[PDB]
Design a protein around this nucleic acid. Structure first.
Ligand SMILES: [Mg+2]
Lengths: 469, 372
DNA sequence: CTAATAGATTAGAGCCGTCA
RNA sequence: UGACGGCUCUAAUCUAUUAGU
């Protein structure tokens, strides 16, 4: 008979040096780490986008209720939970003429009108940022739904501007990298979710029970993009530096141009936990292969180590590299070339797709989350998704597929690696959640990859995650 | 002394927690979960150590407050500020403020019946245990005695080409019908290798590599699984990269096997549970059975619209729970069992590979109380 | 270099659900 | 692109065998 072990709860630190396990109530009862002053917002778009954004900012400061409060916590207001006022008074509105909008949705080609839209938004943003006496905190982007809906990559409307990407968000985020402006991209469908209906009398998707998490998620992401931190960890020990690595492909190009991006947990000596993406995209000319060349991987690891040392003062003993693919011999040689003298390296491979479904004998609820099945000394299943005793509900719907955490190379302890991986599932600032089904060290790198893919000429890339998330 | 006396449940919760957080003592019924001395204490507090106070019951409380007074002779931020100003102006006493008490009360009250129970549990799995293997791995030297386009996968016995050999678990003189020139075969030129050393990892030879040998054996296992599924009058679906084997309609007894429903009807359309065989030798020999749901029109002919397949699968998978997945998997596995405890894969005239019908059982240490 | 048979690995688009 | 998960189809790429010179 085979045995199962349990991994202790990670817990997360909050204001006043308190501790808890759930991020939402850790913020609600105790507050965020720092204290902000205010947030200033500016809408780019039509007057309709202005109206929608003002309505959303008025709704965020007010209490939000659902049918049953057991499933999700309620929203009491952004200022009350973050201790900083942010409403529709510190606003800078930039018009977008409908006449200019109409003149671009006519070429029937996605490339030209997409590039024209990106330019017509970025020029207004830069003009407002430069030639105005106000100082907006976070620049907000509102996009009409139908125009982008017709801007799909493999779609048509029923050469200077033709050799570019066929997507809006990616190129738009890639073109604001050299300006270092915190820009947040909203589709009109998200915020104006109440003014869109159908000819049936009932919504297609039941959004009446996810309003609270929508509000929490957008508020946390915005507050992060304002320069504040909602929470951090309680037991980040010295010698810990998590580093991510995700692969992406550029699709429409002469060469396959495999795109690999990195993200990095580490300490900033301010008694906090600062997440910055020390990422400048590394290109793999070979087709189909998902292995960095020695040069690019060596550069990635050297940049991570230098960032840590210049951030803290000494090279950490241990480095964790969470990857979605396995490693080769020369790649590990490249990572070992810049490894400090008295240090060791661990590479965790997380193969998401593997068939293993477990059944409880009596109950219809799935396996408990923090369970761990030790196949061997260098292999284990960790149910990053599972039943949560804190909220008594199920994170996933169907039977979860446990992640296959393999210590691909190096020597470590399976218990410690699994505990650290479980801990890293709460440090996202996009959505204020309980725990993530995938480590954020393997997801924020992917979001970086999808952001900084549409263009490759950018020099001096942004560091913080306010820009990309 | 030193104490101060269902539509707004969370509002009251947050208000009380915040008032405690700023150092204002709040007494409420949400502290003591147990009920049944519940009113006498309140009356004693009102009569003895109550100085200032901040439906039939509401009327009675209002009357009590009036008697006490006679005897004495937008947003929530504005409300919170007004409450704080009123408390400060009235000079309501307070002690040293701390959040440790609030954290402890939250830990010991909010998540009382949501804790960890140290109880061992047993879980099933989708891995079918493998019992035994035939005594040898057979390689047949079929030199210039078979057609070059003979298409080895058309045979009734599982075999796959390798260099100039043929690998199978059958005798050297099987399937002579499809390959007529078989009789003049010398038996001393057939390579036999025992399964134990090659599978456990004790076979290093130039003829075949261990990873290659494992790939060959799992190919034979998948091919024989396909042949067995064809043998049991079970239709097939050619998936995106693999093959799935789905029972027909009316094959079972009242569409039920061992008190389990595997094929059924949805609206005016028929759905069919299916399985996919993929044997792997890591960590230990198993015969993985992934689960799928396909939809057809009349129950026998597949529908040629992948979008319809995905939409129907996602619509059906919303209502499925752990019990249903377990029951369907175990019933489908038991339906292919032979006699009592295992079903063989017909990989030979008299030689078979035994794979047990009971999936591997996992044992745990910590359980979850599943409180209804 | 080029075309068939398997396994094992990888990404990418497109769609569905959140109540009870 | 407010999030997450579970999926379908989808091709590409590595290894071994075979046949096109
Ligand atoms: Mg972003």
């Amino acid at each position: 008979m085979k045995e199962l072990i349990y991994i202790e709860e990670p817990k997360i630190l909050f204001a006043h040096g308190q501790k808890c396990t759930d991020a939402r109530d850790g913020l609600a009862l105790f507050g965020p780490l720092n204290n902000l002053y205010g947030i200033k917002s500016g809408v780019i778009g039509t007057k309709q986008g202005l109206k929608i954004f003002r309505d959303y900012l008025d709704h965020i400061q007010k209490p939000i209720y659902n049918s049953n409060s057991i499933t999700r916590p309620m929203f009491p207001g952004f200022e009350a939970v973050f201790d900083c006022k942010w409403e529709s008074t510190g606003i800078t509105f930039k018009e977008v003429t409908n006449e200019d909008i109409g003149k671009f949705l006519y070429n029937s080609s996605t490339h030209k009108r997409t590039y024209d839209l990106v330019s017509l938004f970025i020029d207004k943003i830069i003009s407002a940022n430069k030639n105005e006496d106000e100082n907006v905190d976070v620049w907000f982007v509102i996009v009409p739904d139908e125009i982008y809906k017709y801007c799909r990559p493999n779609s048509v409307l029923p050469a200077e501007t033709y050799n570019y990407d066929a997507q809006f968000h990616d190129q738009f985020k890639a073109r604001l990298l050299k300006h270092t402006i915190p820009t947040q991209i909203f589709r009109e469908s998200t915020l104006a979710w109440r003014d869109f209906k159908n000819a049936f009398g009932l919504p297609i998707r039941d959004f009446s029970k996810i309003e609270g998490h929508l509000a929490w998620t957008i508020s946390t992401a915005a507050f992060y993009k304002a320069g504040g931190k909602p929470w951090k960890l309680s037991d980040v020990r010295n010698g810990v530096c998590y580093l991510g690595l995700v692969y992406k492909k550029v699709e429409k190009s002469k060469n396959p141009r495999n795109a690999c991006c990195a993200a990095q947990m580490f300490l900033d000596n301010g008694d906090g936990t600062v997440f910055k993406g020390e990422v400048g995209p590394w290109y793999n000319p070979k087709n189909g292969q998902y292995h960095l060349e020695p040069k690019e991987a060596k550069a990635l690891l050297s940049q991570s180590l230098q960032s840590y040392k210049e951030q803290i003062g000494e090279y950490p003993k241990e480095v964790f590299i969470h990857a979605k693919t396995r490693f080769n011999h020369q790649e590990w040689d490249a990572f070992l070339e810049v490894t400090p003298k008295e240090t060791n390296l661990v590479g965790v491979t997380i193969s998401k797709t593997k068939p293993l479904k477990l059944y409880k004998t009596e109950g219809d609820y799935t396996i408990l989350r923090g369970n761990a099945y030790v196949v061997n000394e260098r292999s284990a299943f960790l149910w990053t998704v599972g039943y949560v005793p804190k909220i008594q509900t199920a994170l996933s719907m169907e039977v979860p597929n446990p992640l296959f955490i393999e210590i691909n190379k190096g020597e470590a302890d399976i218990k410690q690696v699994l505990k650290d991986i479980l801990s890293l599932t709460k440090l996202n600032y996009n959505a204020c959640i309980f725990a993530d089904g995938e480590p954020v060290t393997l997801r924020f790198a992917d979001k970086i990859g999808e952001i900084l893919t549409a263009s490759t000429d950018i020099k001096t890339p942004p560091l913080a995650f306010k820009y990309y998330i | 002394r030193n104490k101060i006396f269902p539509d707004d449940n969370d509002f009251t919760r947050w208000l009380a927690l915040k008032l405690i957080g700023l150092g204002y003592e709040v007494w409420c019924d949400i502290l003591f979960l147990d009920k049944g001395d519940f009113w006498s204490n309140i009356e004693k507090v009102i009569r003895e150590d109550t100085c200032k106070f901040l439906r039939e019951g509401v009327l009675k409380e209002l009357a009590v407050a009036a008697k006490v007074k006679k005897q004495l002779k937008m947003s929530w931020a504005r409300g919170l500020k007004d409450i704080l100003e009123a408390f400060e102006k009235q000079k309501v006493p307070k002690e040293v403020a701390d959040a440790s008490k609030s954290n402890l009360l939250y830990q010991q009250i909010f998540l009382h019946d949501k804790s960890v129970i140290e109880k061992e549990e047993i879980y099933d799995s989708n891995w079918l245990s493998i019992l035994s293997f035939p005594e040898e791995l057979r390689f047949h030297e079929y030199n210039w005695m078979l057609p070059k386009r003979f298409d080895v996968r058309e045979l009734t016995f599982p075999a796959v080409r390798y260099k100039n050999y043929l690998c199978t678990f059958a005798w050297a003189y099987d399937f002579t019908y499809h390959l007529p020139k078989t009789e003049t075969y010398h038996k001393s030129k057939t390579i036999r290798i025992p399964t134990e050393e090659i599978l456990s990892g004790s076979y290093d030879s130039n003829f075949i590599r261990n990873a290659e040998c494992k790939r060959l054996i799992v190919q034979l296992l998948n091919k024989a699984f396909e042949l067995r599924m064809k043998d049991k009058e079970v239709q097939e679906y050619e998936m995106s990269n693999k093959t799935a084997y789905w029972l027909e309609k009316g094959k079972l007894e009242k569409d039920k096997f061992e008190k389990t429903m595997l094929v059924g009807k949805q609206k005016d359309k028929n759905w069919h549970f299916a399985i996919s065989g993929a044997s792997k030798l890591y960590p230990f020999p198993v015969l993985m059975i992934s689960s799928h749901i396909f939809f057809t029109a009349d129950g026998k002919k597949l529908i040629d619209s992948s979008s319809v397949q995905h939409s129907s699968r996602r619509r059906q998978g919303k209502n499925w729970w752990n019990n249903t997945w377990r029951t369907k998997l175990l019933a489908f596995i038991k339906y292919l069992s032979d006699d009592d405890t295992s079903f063989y894969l017909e990989m030979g005239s008299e030689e078979k590979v035994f794979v047990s019908n009971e999936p591997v059982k996992f044992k745990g240490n910590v359980s979850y109380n599943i409180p209804e």
